[PDB]
Amino acid sequence: KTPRRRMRLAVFKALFQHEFRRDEDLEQILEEILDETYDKKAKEDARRYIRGIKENLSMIDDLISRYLEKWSLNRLSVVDRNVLRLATYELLFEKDIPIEVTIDEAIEIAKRYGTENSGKFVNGILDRIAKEHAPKEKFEL
Missing domain, CATH: 1.10.940.10 (NusB-like)
Incomplete structure (x- = not known):
């Protein structure tokens, strides 16, 4: 339902916005962008992406x-x-x-x-x- 394209865009937003909030946590900003308009699947995928990007x-x-x-x-x-x-x-x-x-x-x-x-x-x-x-x-x- 929630397009994969929109999920990925949520990850990009978190990355973009984190460059101006570096002493805050990437995962935190992600949880701001992620609201009730994003599927369960989309929330889980976006979280994996962010955790994987931070770790690597x-x-x-x-x-x-x-x-x-x-x-x-x-x-x-x-x-x-x-x-x-x-x-x-x-x-x-x-x-x-x-x-x-x-x-x-x-x-x-x-x-x-x-x-x-x-x-x-x-x-x-x-x-x-x-x-x-x-x-x-x-x-x-």
Whole structure:
């Protein structure tokens, strides 16, 4: 019922809003965005995403940094950095989602909230990260 797309957008919001509330807890902000309009399934998925991102934040950031050919991670816009994080987390840890879906949905968040070049920017980076880091079983999907 609650679209997976909206669930993922809730995760992105938490990430975005946490950059301005760092001494608060990611999980806390998530619980603010999550209200009675989000399915049980959506609340559980979003919570998994946030816990997984927090637990793997260093590894995820270091992975993205490896594929940045221009500005460093800290120098990207808040939207671009967090889109890359979310999409990288989903590529690495969410088994049921095809690569193309993760990247396409990431591009749409980028296009909607970022700069004019955000969509192409994240597309390029995620294409490379997926090719070399998506778990092998995903290449069946």
